[PDB]
Amino acid sequence: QLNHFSDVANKAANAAGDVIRKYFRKNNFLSPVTIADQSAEEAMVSVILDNFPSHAVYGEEKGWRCKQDSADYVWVLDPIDGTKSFITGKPLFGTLIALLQNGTPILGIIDQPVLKERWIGITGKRTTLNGQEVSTRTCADLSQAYLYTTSPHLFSGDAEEAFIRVRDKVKIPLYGCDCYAYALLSSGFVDLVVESGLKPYDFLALIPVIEGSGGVITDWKGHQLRWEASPLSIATSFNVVAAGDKQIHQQALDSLQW
Amino acid sequence: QLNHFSDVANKAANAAGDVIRKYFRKNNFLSPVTIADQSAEEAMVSVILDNFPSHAVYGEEKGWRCKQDSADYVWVLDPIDGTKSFITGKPLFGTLIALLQNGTPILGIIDQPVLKERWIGITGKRTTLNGQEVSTRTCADLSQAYLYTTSPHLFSGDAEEAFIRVRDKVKIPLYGCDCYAYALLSSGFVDLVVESGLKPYDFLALIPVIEGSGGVITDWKGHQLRWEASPLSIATSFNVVAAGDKQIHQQALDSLQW
Ligand SMILES: [Cl-]
Numbered sequence A, B: 001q002l003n004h005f006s007d008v009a010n011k012a013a014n015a016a017g018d019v020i021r022k023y024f025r026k027n028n029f030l031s032p033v034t035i036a037d038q039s040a041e042e043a044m045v046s047v048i049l050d051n052f053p054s055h056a057v058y059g060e061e062k063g064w065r066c067k068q069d070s071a072d073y074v075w076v077l078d079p080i081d082g083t084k085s086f087i088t089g090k091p092l093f094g095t096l097i098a099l100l101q102n103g104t105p106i107l108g109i110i111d112q113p114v115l116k117e118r119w120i121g122i123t124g125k126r127t128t129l130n131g132q133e134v135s136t137r138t139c140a141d142l143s144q145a146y147l148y149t150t151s152p153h154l155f156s157g158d159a160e161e162a163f164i165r166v167r168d169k170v171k172i173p174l175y176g177c178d179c180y181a182y183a184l185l186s187s188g189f190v191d192l193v194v195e196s197g198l199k200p201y202d203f204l205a206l207i208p209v210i211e212g213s214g215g216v217i218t219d220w221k222g223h224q225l226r227w228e229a230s231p232l233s234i235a236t237s238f239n240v241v242a243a244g245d246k247q248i249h250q251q252a253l254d255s256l257q258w
């Protein structure tokens, strides 16, 4: 069963990547990004549900869908995380696939279909990039950490104050690539990622990837980042902090003061 | 002679790309980026000067070099524009090659060796990406423009105020990829790029690329962005504004108030 979930997840990613590649970089003059997202989601759902008709699927547009009233297994998908990147021709958006068992992610994929880079996290296994194991790196102190976040403008209210406290303490704050930064963290090239306002379809896949690489990912209070997808779950936004090194993670929590 | 300059420039880029690819993503535990930069520069200079022994070369580390007291032709190079991207494993740095005749760029290359994307601007020709012509796009008003800049933190003093006036007027401000944003602008996926603090080795190659795509690139006063490389030229930093559409460019100048 487990390796069957992985095989189907990879089939889904393969289909999404072909769809996305058809539409990427077509807009130099419904928009291609909306067609691409919808068509990619459909391609993924189709192969998932053909294999697993008792499973549910969750997506931004259609919300929860399941042929039954409830499901033990829920696939939570974002064909294009990083729409602004996609729209502007920057190949650092990603396709995110998560499978949840009883509300907990057991598999996550971050796929960059232009670069042909696929990170796969599976509970029980070390995370891989294109089939090869990866690991986070150690970091001596927050002052030595390379930090990413998507944009300085995606922090509102009290969250902006909190971000700034961490931002001012790191080696350097870098910007602009959505899920891709978490992939880099999982491969040991980035020490910290701090974001505010992520929907569950844009973080659940990250969890197995990062944890299975040796990293840490929580909400800004240090609690488990969780979203139990269900017929009534609300796709609200969460604050995320991921680190390659647990000591860095704690220093970040202490600066956020959330 | 002209097509000979292009052929040699491409040879230089091919060599740099192999060197860079050897070192990219090696640092997950002299640094690889410094070895890569030095070795790539050496590879480029070697083939340039083997072909053109009367030419000069200019680089960050070694400054002006020429076997003669003066030169009509000067190659101005940056093997790795976007060192922070390189160091953190993000494949959006670029290799920049410019050839100047009497101080004016006649050829520019933006090469992304991981993505295998090469933009070439040559005076007299339309700009190409991987051999295919590209063009900028029209934009109706600054309020519709997609803007890129590397980082919010790379504006100091009065330049930060000026950037903010433009930033607040565009459709959306996006961040994080150095020369790559100018390549996207040249291909018609980005409308505006506004940066402060660019060395001449990080802007001269951009000029033929953007102009030959139909765009506009100047300093923040709208004057020609120029740097006459010479035995005594000083590699200071410049403010740059590039637009796909001349009307947008002028609206940006009016907001910068430089
Ligand atoms: Cl089933």
Ligand SMILES: [Cl-]
Binding pocket: B051, B052, B053, B054, B055
């Ligand atoms: Cl010569």
